[PDB]
Structures are given as structure tokens and as C-alpha cells.
């Protein structure tokens, strides 16, 4: 099969900057019919691939003018001239000149932006869940930047580490920030045996932790 | 307008079978070779099977990993492409996409999950406490995915749905929405949670 070597694997740049991705082929992609079947695809998190550029340079309908493709033979380039917030995601080259179809390994584009502090929220278990004999405490950290963040749970002043599950969103297509969810799971017995539930958040925007608590 | 639409797929046990299909609309696909392409969760795209056109005797080719287990076929009279998947293995778990050799038009894809664990519907719990942040805890389901909307899709900005985390064979996710606190005052705020594999779709109104 034709090997498409795509580079770099990740890109990061601010709004308004230009970025380029390279797709290099083990075989010439010029077909005997005269066309060069090299396309560029964008894939957003949890979405199907969509066409950006086809036949090296032709822009798909609806795709902004700032995208361009070029190259010939075995070497191709996608350029974004003036990144916008919505351009994030994973870019792949694909060739269909030589069967079977093959794909580059993908380039993930992230957006660089100004530091932004997390907005923190804490949520006690619901009645409905307690009624089942389980408990879950949730702490949200919304719209921060950069992605690096630390979250800790304290119960009546003692840190709790078991039963914690953490999850970070994909970068936001509108404001280029990240968000994180932390879930503290414990038995109804355990939950009712304590009073003060605290979410403690440390982000580079401040030396002081952001602290949210409730009393059971 | 050219369009490909996939159907079939779902959850199946190792060694079982599934047939998925791809319906083409808007221009004939008779003059193009057709492909199934797959993407394992968090990985890239790879071809799975290939079928030629009538002049080339509808010749079929397969990736090494599926040879002798998958069968690709096409029915040009119905603008249909199919993949019969037999003797399914856990590592066949992927989104499957249909496309032509020109690779310009793509379906929405279908999820094929291969696992010996049986389906579990999620438990959906409210997360209740200027802008207010509300949420839904979607706990203890299998397999992926679920879809979460807010007021059936009417509330779309300021939505965060967090990637699911797997723990003891069950997934958990949260979704949140941030609304003006006057909105929560007057309007209902409801999360809708669909889980295809358990045939469930549940609403949770967020009560103050």
C-alpha cells in the first residue's frame, strides 16, 4: 500500500497565525488519467471526517478561503493562512490514486490563547442516587487555559484519593479553553459519615487554590 | 447532492456476525471502486475492504487483519454497498465508514462494538448547585456511546460534555450547561440522554 507520511503530529499557534502540514508519499500520486487524487480531511471530536480540499488544491464547497492545498508527485502541503478558533481538530491527508485508499497518520491542531482562570462549581449527590445506596460528588472547572490543572478532594479536611475519576474536554471551538470534571464516588454510609466536602483547584493563573465546598 | 448513509452495527459478542450497509444518493457510484474504512476509538483511519466496478469483475480485496472474515459486496441496481463481518474480534471495535476511491464523500459512520460484556443502561442524575452552571451525571453504562443534549438541543452554547471514563467495566460521564440564572428561574432545564445499545432515552429536569 502507498505510505503517506504526515508531519508534524501536532501544531499549536495563536488566532491569526499561519500553519502548514506536510503529506509525503511513497509513490507518485499523479494518476495515468492526469488527476492527482490527494485530498485533505478535517475530523472534529466525535464527528465523521469531512472534506476540506480535493484533487490537491480544489476547495470543497463551504470551506473558508484561508485553507489551501498544494504539491505534486510525492509531496503535498495543506496551509491555513490566519488560523481561527473554529479550525481546531485533526487533519488527515488521503490518497485514492493507487488502490487501496491510504491515509496520513493525522495532525492535531491546538490553539494558543491567553491564560484564563477556571470557574469552579461543586455539586452534592442527588436524592435519587442516594436512594440507591451510592453517592457521587462532582466538581467542575470551566473554561480555563492552559490545559494543565490540579484538582483535589478534601473530606472534613482530609484529602481523599480513592474513588476519584477525572475527565478533560477537547479544546473549545469558540473560546479555545478547556474544562474539566472531577467525580468523587463513595458509599451512602461513607457519604453520610462526613460533613464538609471540598473541591480544591490549582491552576497557573493563581498561586491561591480555587476552593468550593458544601456541608452535607 | 452526493450523499452516503450507513446503517447496521451495534454491540455484538466475540465470534458473532454483523452486516452493515451503505446507501448512496444523488449521483451513481457505478463507475467508482468502493471502500469500507475503519477508525478504532482514538486512532486514525485505515482501509478494511475494497470492491472494484463491473468492468473489473467486481474484484474484492481485504486488509490482512480481516481477510477470510469480512466480505464486501455491492448492488449497483440499488446503489448499495455492504460489509458482512463474521467471527468478530474485540479489536474490530471501530467506527466503520463507507467511501468511494475518490475519497471525496463520506457517510456519518456506524459504530461496531465487539465485547463479551452485556449492555447496561445509564443512571442519569441531576447536578443542581450571574450565570448558573447546571449538569447531568450519566453513570454506569456500557458500551459507548451516549448522546447528551440540553432542552433537546435548544441549549447548545455553554455546553460541556466530558469524555467518559471507564471504571470496572462501566462508563461514567458528566455534561454541564451554563445559562443566565434568570433562564433557570423561569424556564425548565432538562438533559436528554440517549444510549443506543440499551434502547433507552431518558430526561432529567434540573430541579432547584
Amino acid at each position: 500500500d502507498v505510505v503517506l507520511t504526515q508531519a508534524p503530529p501536532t501544531l499549536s499557534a495563536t488566532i491569526g497565525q499561519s500553519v502548514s502540514i506536510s503529506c509525503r508519499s511513497s509513490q507518485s500520486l499523479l494518476h495515468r488519467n492526469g488527476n492527482t487524487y490527494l485530498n485533505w480531511l478535517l475530523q472534529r471530536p466525535g464527528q465523521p471526517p469531512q472534506l476540506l480540499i480535493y484533487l490537491v488544491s480544489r476547495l470543497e464547497s463551504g470551506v473558508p478561503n484561508r485553507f489551501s492545498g498544494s504539491g505534486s508527485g510525492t509531496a503535498f502541503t495543506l496551509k491555513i493562512s490566519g488560523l481561527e478558533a473554529e479550525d481546531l481538530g485533526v487533519y488527515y491527508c488521503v490518497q485514492g490514486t493507487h488502490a487501496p485508499l491510504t491515509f496520513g497518520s493525522g495532525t492535531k491542531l491546538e490553539i494558543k490563547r491567553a491564560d484564563a482562570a477556571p470557574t469552579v462549581s461543586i455539586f452534592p449527590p442527588s436524592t435519587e442516587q442516594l436512594a440507591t445506596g451510592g453517592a457521587s460528588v462532582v466538581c467542575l472547572m470551566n473554561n480555563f487555559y492552559p490545559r494543565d490543572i490540579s484538582v483535589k478532594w478534601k473530606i472534613d479536611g482530609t484529602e481523599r484519593r480513592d474513588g476519584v475519576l477525572d475527565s478533560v474536554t477537547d479544546q473549545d471551538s469558540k473560546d479555545s479553553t478547556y474544562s474539566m470534571s472531577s467525580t468523587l464516588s463513595l458509599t451512602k454510609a461513607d457519604y453520610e459519615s462526613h460533613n464538609l466536602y471540598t473541591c480544591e483547584v490549582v491552576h497557573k493563573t493563581s498561586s491561591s487554590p480555587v476552593v468550593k465546598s458544601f456541608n452535607r | 447532492a452526493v450523499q452516503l448513509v450507513e446503517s447496521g452495527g451495534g454491540l455484538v459478542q466475540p465470534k458473532e456476525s454483523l452486516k452493515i450497509s451503505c446507501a448512496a444518493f444523488g449521483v451513481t457510484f457505478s463507475n467508482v471502486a468502493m471502500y469500507w474504512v475503519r477508525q478504532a476509538p482514538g486512532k486514525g483511519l485505515e482501509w478494511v475492504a475494497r470492491i472494484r466496478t463491473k468492468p473489473n469483475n467486481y474484484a474484492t480485496y481485504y486488509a490482512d487483519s480481516v481477510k477470510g472474515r469480512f466480505t464486501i459486496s455491492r448492488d449497483d441496481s440499488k446503489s448499495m454497498v455492504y460489509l458482512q463481518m463474521d467471527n468478530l474480534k474485540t479489536e474490530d471495535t471501530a467506527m466503520y465508514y463507507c467511501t468511494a476511491e475518490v475519497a471525496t464523500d463520506w457517510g456519518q459512520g456506524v459504530m461496531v462494538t465487539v465485547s463479551s460484556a452485556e449492555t447496561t443502561a445509564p443512571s442519569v442524575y441531576p447536578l443542581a448547585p450571574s450565570m448558573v452552571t447546571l449538569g447531568c451525571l450519566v453513570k454506569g453504562y456500557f458500551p459507548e456511546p451516549v448522546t447528551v443534549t440540553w432542552n433537546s438541543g435548544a441549549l447548545s452554547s455553554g455546553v460541556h460534555t466530558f469524555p467518559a471514563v471507564l471504571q470496572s467495566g462501566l462508563y461514567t460521564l458528566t455534561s454541564s450547561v451554563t445559562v443566565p440564572s434568570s433562564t433557570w428561574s423561569s424556564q425548565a432545564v432538562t438533559c436528554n440522554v440517549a444510549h443506543p445499545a440499551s434502547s433507552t432515552k431518558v430526561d432529567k429536569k434540573i430541579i432547584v
Binding site: 488502490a99 | 463507475n31 471502486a33 471525496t104
Partner: peptide, 11 residues
């Protein structure tokens, strides 16, 4: 780009 389908592509 419908002409790609009219013209065809197979190998």
C-alpha cells in the same frame, strides 16, 4: 465534482 463520478475511478 460530480464529474468525478461520471468519469469514474477504479485502480
Amino acid at each position: 465534482r460530480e464529474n468525478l463520478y461520471f468519469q469514474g475511478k477504479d485502480g
